[PDB]
Design a binder for these strands. Structure first.
Ligand SMILES: [K+]
Ligand SMILES: [K+]
Ligand SMILES: [K+]
Ligand SMILES: [Mg+2]
Ligand SMILES: [Mg+2]
Ligand SMILES: [Mg+2]
Ligand SMILES: [Mg+2]
Ligand SMILES: [Mg+2]
Ligand SMILES: [Mg+2]
Ligand SMILES: [Mg+2]
Length: 188
RNA sequence: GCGGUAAUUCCAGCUCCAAUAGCGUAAUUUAAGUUGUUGCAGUUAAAAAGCUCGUAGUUGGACUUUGGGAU
């Protein structure tokens, strides 16, 4: 089969050139690499986007089906390290696709699951962005000027894997939810 | 509170004071945060049932869409 099977855009939309490039990269990863050949046969991405994080640096965010989030997680590290070498120093982020439902209008009898609330989806996205790190604390500081800055504490165990991705995580989260977040490692 | 033999307080004279064609005397408001919703009290001044349960009544933790771009 072709690489088009690795990309499934919503409503069968036509992907851009970056989606095609990422799908091709995944296809060659499945084919050439034997260790990941078994895992990647039934894995496809919903969409792929590019976000700039700093001068002369950029990051690529890949959205994957919700039902395959566990499968992607169990192979996250190898896949990210293999894909990074192909984009010339661009970090790769996997975020499961989720739907946000607006609150029911006042007086309506419609009920919305709490998982579909904006806050729950934002928390899930924040949990997914720092993979493989695990969040161990959260602080929100309300500045005098009226701005909010959130501090997220990550487990030091994944320091070697996450330390260099902090700025990319901040930029990606800001783009995805418009929230200012900083990452720090507890001292101990 | 005055008056019991030196009475600014009674009975009078004089003088003086308040209001003034008005003034005195015999339900109700304010003052009253002395009925307190605003806004009172309950150790010793009046005051929390000997103790617990308990239906009416009153009261009841947190959580679900924020932000920027612009205009
Ligand atoms: K006498
Ligand atoms: K006398
Ligand atoms: K008198
Ligand atoms: Mg006399
Ligand atoms: Mg006289
Ligand atoms: Mg009293
Ligand atoms: Mg007594
Ligand atoms: Mg008493
Ligand atoms: Mg008693
Ligand atoms: Mg009784």
């Amino acid at each position: 089969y072709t690489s088009r099977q690795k990309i499934h855009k919503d409503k069968d939309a036509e992907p851009t050139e970056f989606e095609e490039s990422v799908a091709q990269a995944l296809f060659d990863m499945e084919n050439t690499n034997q260790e990941l050949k078994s895992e990647l046969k039934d894995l496809y991405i919903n969409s792929a986007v590019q976000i700039d994080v700093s001068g002369n640096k950029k990051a690529v965010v890949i959205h994957v089906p919700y039902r395959l989030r566990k499968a992607f997680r169990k192979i996250h590290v190898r896949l990210v390290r293999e894909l990074e070498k192909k984009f010339s120093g661009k970090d790769v982020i996997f975020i499961a696709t989720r739907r946000i439902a607006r609150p029911p209008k006042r007086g309506s009898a419609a009920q919305r699951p709490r998982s579909r609330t904006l806050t729950s989806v934002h928390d899930a996205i924040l949990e997914d962005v720092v993979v493989p790190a695990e969040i161990v604390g959260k602080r929100v500081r309300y500045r005098v000027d009226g701005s909010k800055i959130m501090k997220v504490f990550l487990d030091p165990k994944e320091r070697n894997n996450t330390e260099y991705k902090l700025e990319t995580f901040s930029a990606v989260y800001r783009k995805l939810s418009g929230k200012d977040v900083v990452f720090e490692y507890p001292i101990t």
